[PDB]
RNA sequence: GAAACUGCGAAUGGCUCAUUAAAUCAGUUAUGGUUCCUUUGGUCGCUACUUGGAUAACUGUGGUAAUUCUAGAGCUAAUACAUGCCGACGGCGCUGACUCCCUUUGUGUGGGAUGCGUGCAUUUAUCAGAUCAAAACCAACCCGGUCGCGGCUUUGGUGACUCUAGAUAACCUCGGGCCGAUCGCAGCCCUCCGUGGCGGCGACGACCCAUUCGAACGUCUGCCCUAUCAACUUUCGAUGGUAGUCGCCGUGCCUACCAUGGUGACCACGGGUGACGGGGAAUCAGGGUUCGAUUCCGGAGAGGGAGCCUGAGAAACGGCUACCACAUCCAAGGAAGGCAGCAGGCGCGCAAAUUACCCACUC
């Protein structure tokens, strides 16, 4: 049907070539996955040698790494915001490798606040004191405050992330192939990559 | 030089990572990027401009994702209107055995030329080795450039 | 068309060293898939029918094997086209005799009878060294045998000795200058000599120079050299003619002078 | 209960074809009205839809509840010996045997 | 031990030469850019003294002019199909109520209640990988010793890896990765009288390495006649760049954006060929000319084009679906088809054998 051959097309000189044989089965191609945001729908295909391949049609969740902090957790996927290859892919919300996405900040915030014994995403006292202060302060015999200098002297986060945590969403990049692995999975944007894509997002519409 | 992110997607070397911890540098600073590079083997030497440079090129032999294997060849630089690729000419004699005499022939190759070579000119001599297919018509990559066994660029004092 | 693997062999396409006649047939035995390459083996049917002559037809070979009489490397084999090859031992316990496959100096397998205490071991050339999970070291031989926990001095191109009842390593010979070897491919096939120089090239093939007992010199690609003894002495018994490769004029003169072949 | 039938020209009825006409379907392993001669075989052949009409050669029917009267031969005749079970748990399940 | 279910093979062999001029093919090299039934060698311990329901052969009743067409009813199996323990968790890292000793903290300790994760495969992110030349001060100390001097250590391999092995945080495929609810011969040893087991020989099966048989894609050089063929290709992808999709994998293979390239008198581009390529054959002082459909090797195709199931392997035709050309049977509703296999026939033409016997030999 669809095929990926080299012989249907012309040579260096601009000259044509005639067909050598009928279409062979090892020259095959197949339609694209076009993965959307939505509750899990995966289908499987048999491939050359009798092996199996996984094709994701809908995904709602992924695995993401905050490489700066050595933290990775299972996280909800919210939206797609930039695509370097084609604007119709963000207009129709399709998920592919090196796409830029928004993810839920919560499991990183909960890891940080319990690891460093400090607040992160907080606005004002009404969202600090009335509950869950007992995550931050407890009885800690000979481990109370000064021994947390192992934590507190390296706790400060970049200003570009502290502005994202207050809105409840982080920017991330997809590293897996979702139409081939069945998974959507990647890493949190940081530093000069975050400056580059914030300029590109703002310069397109804002 | 001062900017390299001229594309719609961010440009970086794979296998290099930048720490977002212990970031203080005071009134001055140093390079946030270390550089990846490798030895090619076969008695070739890596150019200084690959180690001291800041360019991104995935098809580069010294700083990218290619393996040099099989045949090593040479030819004369003859055209360079494409970007990061050039055309070289190879000339030879063919024997026709009914007569006891030779015939002159040529072929052209398109080859990939990275930054780190930046003073090449038409009529220079270039050495190349095989790769995996790099594009439709490209199979070879530049390992060394020279102008030995010939006249100077400008006057004899060059 | 060719839609999958082939399973026949024409008799004019078969390996020259089997010495098959021209006129009995169209086909030859296709060697069974196994430890040795199709070009480099001797099918068991050609050894029993054509070399030893214990059977007049392929059916008389089939009813020797199905009685469980034939052992190769100490294991009973019922397959009549099994690919036996260099350094293997064949034992026939019912007639009371043992053989080893070694090249004649004209580049073909000799019949070579051996004593039952020499039928207990074989020599193996090393093909590969690698490390598996939990850091365990592995070895691979020229006949597909895989060994765990080899001695850390055993490197590429070396020769190891194994006992056939247990399959474990007993002793080894290093590849270095002055050791005795046999040639296992090319035009020099079936010659014996001492290694005298190795010349190396980065990419393409290394070349070894070898010296004869009579002082002749010859060379080949490194893939054709098999080491068989530390210094001057072999670890195996050797066939008539001992790898010396005399020329056609010397061979004429001994055939006239010795009056052999019932003169 | 109505269990199926045959058309004129002998074509069978099959469940799920919602018409009084006949149709041609590409049949494959696991459908009724076909028996494959090779692994992976499919063949296109004629079948009749589900709706009952005057056109049929025969209707198949099964008695799901008996009346008070007896229909001659069909409902007088007592059951045959069948064949007994062969799996061990099946024998225990028939005779209510203990696990020991 | 008929039949039937299940497993394996049917992708090899045999036939022909229509298409096809850098294509096929030959010599030479490469997968550090992939896949691989079987054979051979590694590997095979993070209700359980044995689970579930349901069909074929068979028995019984039918429909159509007709086929290796099949429908309704009554029974019963598994190495078919689907579930799922037991045994051998006793892991080691991270938490740390409390507690003890020199020094209230910090900082050096040894214990430690209690939670969480903890085989190999799979997806992503991070860490480490040790070796070199020469001195002088300072905080704190390894150690020989005590209130300033001597002396050092740790997977493997290639010409070359973003290799192999190792450590950390998570994922995990489920109905949609592995870790045996299977079969046949001889019997055994005992806190032992038929019990707890442990065990000899196998047979079949399955995830992962390495082999063997290959297949696929790529490198360099090699071709018959023609100018009454001189310029050609180019978002209708032509040459190249960046990101991606698809695929067993490299790649304009395809999509979006961008650049303006690529080949030619050393003959491109176009047309012809009673053109399948090579090993080879006839003739021949020396040099040549002509031929090669044809038993070995490589390629292509089963009336003409196209699409696809099953499988490790096919875009298969002694498999299937449709259009186009032929054409057989009919109760006019319908059903069935492919000799460039072996014999045999018609047509063509100057032009080519028997509708014989057998698996004894070679495989």
Residues C156, C229: one domain? no
Residue C94 lies in a domain: yes
Domains along the sequence of chain B with CATH = 2-152 (2.40.50.1000)
CA of C222 to C1' of E35 (A): 30
Is C39 inside a domain boundary? yes
Out of C98, C117, C136, pick the residue that ends a domain: C117
**Residues of chain A contacting B5 with CB distance shorter than 8 Å:** 196
B20-57 burial by CB neighbour count: b if 16+ within 10 A, else e?
eeeeeeeeeeeeeeeeebeebeeebeebeebeebeebb
For residue C256, is it within any domain? Answer: no
A68–B19 C-beta distance less than 8 A: yes
Residue C212 maps to a domain: yes
C55 lies in some domain: yes
The structure's method of determination equals cryo-EM
Q: Nearest nucleotide by C1' from A35 CA?
A: E245
| CB within 8 Å: C203 and B42 | yes
Among C135, C152, C172, the domain boundary falls at C172
C11 and C97 share one domain: yes
The domain spanning residue C58 has which CATH number? 3.10.290.10
B59 CA: nearest nucleotide by C1': E241
Which chain C residues contact residue B42 at CB under 8 A?
202-203
Q: How many B-C residue pairs are in contact by the CB < 8 A criterion?
A: 5
Whether C34 and C68 share a structural domain:
yes
Please tell me which residue of chain A has the smallest CA distance to B17: A67
Q: What is the DSSP letter of D46?
A: E
Residues of B in contact with C203 (CB under 8 A): 42, 69
- Is residue C60 included in any domain, yes or no? yes
How far apart are alpha carbons C63 and C45 in whole angstroms? 12
Per the listing, tokens 């070879």 go with B140
Size of the A and B interface in Cβ pairs below 8 Å: 23
What is the resolution of the experimental data for this entry, in Å? 2.9
DSSP for D66-89 reads: --SSPPTTTTTSPPP------SHH
Domains held by chain C: number = 3
Query: Do residue C75 and residue C140 come from a single domain?
Result: no
Residue B134 exposure: Cα atoms within 13 Å on the Cβ side: 25
How wide is the angle at C-alpha C196 spanned by C-alphas C194 and C197, nearest 5°? Answer: 140
Partner residue facing A191 (CB), from B20, B22, B137:
B20
**What tokens were used for B25?**
């540098």
Asked if C34 and C135 sit in the same domain, the reply is: no
Query: Which of B56, B59, B55, B77 has the alpha carbon at shortest distance from B68?
Result: B59
Chain centre to alpha carbon of residue A22: 43
A181-CA/E84-C1' distance, Å:
30
C85 with C15: CB under 8 angstroms? no
Task: Report CA(D99)–C1'(E181) in Å, whole number.
Answer: 18
Q: Are residues C40 and C10 in the same domain?
A: yes
CA of A149 and C1' of E99: distance in angstroms?
25
Contact: B10, A196; criterion CB under 8 Å: yes
Chains that touch C (3 or more CB pairs under 8 A): B
With H, G, I as helix, E, B as strand and everything else as coil, classify residue C243: coil
C70 bridge partner residues = C92
Q: How far apart are CA A55 and CA A39, in angstroms?
A: 14
Does residue C133 lie in a domain region? Answer: yes
Sequence-distant (6+) residues with CB within 8 A of D69 are none
Domain final residue, candidates C156, C172, C188: C172
Query: Both C137 and C165 in a single domain?
Result: yes
- A19 vs C130: CA distance, rounded Å: 46
Chains that touch B (3 or more CB pairs under 8 A): A, C
Report angle CA B15, B17, B20 to the nearest 5 degrees: 170
DSSP SS3 for C118: helix
Same domain for C111 and C55:
yes
From the alpha carbon of A147, which nucleotide's C1' atom is closest? E106
Asked whether residue C76 falls in the same domain as residue C126, the answer is no
- C165 within domain boundaries: yes
Give the B-side interface with C, CB within 8 Å: 41-43, 69
SS (H, E, C) chain B: CCCCCCCCCCCCCCCCCCCCCCCCCCCCCCCCCCCCCCCCCCCCCCCHHHHCCCCCCCCCCCCCCCCCEEEEEEEEEEECCCCCEEEEEEEEEEEECCCCEEEEEEEEEEEECCCCCCCCCCCCEEEEEECCCCCCCCCEEEEEEECCCCCCCCCCCC
How far is the first Cα of chain A from the last one, in angstroms, to the nearest whole number?
A: 44
CATH code at position C146: 2.40.50.740
Contact B20 A68 (CB under 8 A): yes
For residues C184 and C94, state if they share a domain: no
Same domain, C83 and C17: yes
Q: Which structural domain range is residue C212 located in?
A: 175-245
Q: Are residues C23 and C113 in the same domain?
A: yes
Q: Which nucleotide is nearest to D82 (CA to C1')?
A: E75
Residue from B25, B24, B17, B33 nearest A153 by CA? B24
In this structure, what token pair is assigned to residue B154?
A: 């400008």
C83-120 burial by CB neighbour count: b if 16+ within 10 A, else e?
Answer: bbbbbbbbbbeeeeebbbbbbbbebebbebebeeeebe
């Amino acid at each position: 049907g669809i095929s990926r051959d080299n012989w249907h097309k012309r040579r260096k000189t601009g000259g044509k070539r005639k067909p050598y044989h009928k279409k062979r089965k090892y020259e095959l191609g197949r339609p694209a996955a076009n993965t959307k945001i939505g509750p899990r729908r995966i289908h499987t295909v048999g491939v050359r040698g009798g092996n199996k391949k996984y094709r994701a049609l809908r995904l709602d969740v992924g695995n993401f790494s905050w490489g700066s902090e050595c933290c990775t957790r299972k996280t909800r996927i919210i939206d797609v915001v930039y695509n370097a290859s084609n604007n119709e892919l963000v207009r129709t919300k399709t998920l592919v490798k090196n796409c830029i996405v928004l993810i839920d900040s919560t499991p990183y915030r909960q890891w940080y606040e319990s690891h460093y014994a400090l607040p992160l995403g907080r606005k004002k006292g009404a969202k600090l004191t009335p509950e869950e202060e007992e995550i931050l302060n407890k009885k800690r015999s000979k481990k109370i405050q000064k021994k947390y200098d192992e934590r507190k002297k390296n706790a400060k986060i970049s200003s570009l992330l502290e502005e994202q945590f207050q809105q409840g969403k982080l920017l991330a990049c997809i590293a897996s192939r979702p139409g081939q692995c069945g998974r959507a999975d990647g890493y949190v944007l940081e530093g000069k990559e975050l400056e580059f894509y914030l300029r590109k997002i703002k310069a397109r519409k804002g | 030089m001062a900017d390299i992110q001229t594309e719609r997607a961010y440009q970086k070397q794979p296998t290099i990572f930048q720490n977002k911890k212990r970031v203080l540098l005071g009134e001055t600073g140093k390079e946030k990027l270390p550089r990846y590079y490798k030895n090619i083997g076969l008695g070739f030497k890596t150019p200084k401009e690959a180690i001291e440079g800041t360019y991104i090129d995935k098809k580069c032999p010294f700083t990218g994702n290619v393996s040099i294997r099989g045949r090593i060849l040479s030819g004369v630089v003859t055209k360079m209107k494409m970007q990061r690729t050039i055309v070289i000419r190879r000339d030879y004699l063919h024997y026709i055995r009914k007569y006891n005499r030779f015939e002159k022939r040529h072929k052209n190759m398109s080859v990939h030329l990275s930054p780190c070579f930046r003073d090449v000119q038409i009529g220079d001599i270039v050495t190349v080795g095989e790769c995996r297919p790099l594009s439709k018509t490209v199979r070879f990559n530049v390992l060394k450039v020279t102008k030995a066994a010939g006249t100077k660029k400008q006057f004899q004092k060059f | 068309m060719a839609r999958g693997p082939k399973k026949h062999l024409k008799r004019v396409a078969a390996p020259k060293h089997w010495m098959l006649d021209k006129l009995t047939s169209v086909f030859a035995p296709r060697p069974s898939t196994g430890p040795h390459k199709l070009r480099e083996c001797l099918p068991l049917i050609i050894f029993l029918r054509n070399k030893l002559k214990y059977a007049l037809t392929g059916d008389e070979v089939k009813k020797i094997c199905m009685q469980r009489f034939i052992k190769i490397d100490g294991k009973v084999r019922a397959d009549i086209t099994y690919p036996a090859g260099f350094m293997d031992v064949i034992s026939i316990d019912k007639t009371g005799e043992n053989f080893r496959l070694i090249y004649d100096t004209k580049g073909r397998f000799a019949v070579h009878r051996i004593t039952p205490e020499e039928a207990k071991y074989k020599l193996c050339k090393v093909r590969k060294i690698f490390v598996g999970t939990k850091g365990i070291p592995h070895l691979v031989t020229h006949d597909a045998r895989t060994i765990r926990y080899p001695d850390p001095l055993i490197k590429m191109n070396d020769t190891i000795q194994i006992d056939l009842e247990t399959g474990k390593i007993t002793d080894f010979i290093k590849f270095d200058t002055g050791n005795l070897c046999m040639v296992t491919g090319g035009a020099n096939l079936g010659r014996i000599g001492v290694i005298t120089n190795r010349e190396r090239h980065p990419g393409s093939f290394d070349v070894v120079h070898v010296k004869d007992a009579n002082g002749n010199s010859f060379a080949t690609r490194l893939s054709n050299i098999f080491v068989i003894g530390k210094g001057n002495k072999p670890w195996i018994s050797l066939p008539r003619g001992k790898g010396i490769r005399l020329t056609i004029a010397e061979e004429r003169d001994k055939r006239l002078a010795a009056k052999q072949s019932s003169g | 209960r109505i269990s199926g039938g045959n058309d004129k020209q002998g074509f069978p009825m099959k469940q799920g074809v919602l018409t009084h006409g006949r149709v041609r379907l590409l049949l494959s392993k696991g459908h009724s009205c076909y028996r494959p001669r090779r692994t992976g075989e499919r063949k296109r052949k004629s079948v009749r839809g589900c709706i009952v009409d005057a056109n049929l050669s025969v209707l198949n029917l099964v008695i799901v509840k008996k009346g008070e009267k007896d229909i001659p031969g069909l409902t007088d005749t007592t059951v045959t010996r069948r064949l007994g079970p062969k799996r061990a748990s099946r024998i225990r399940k028939l005779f209510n045997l203990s696990k020991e």
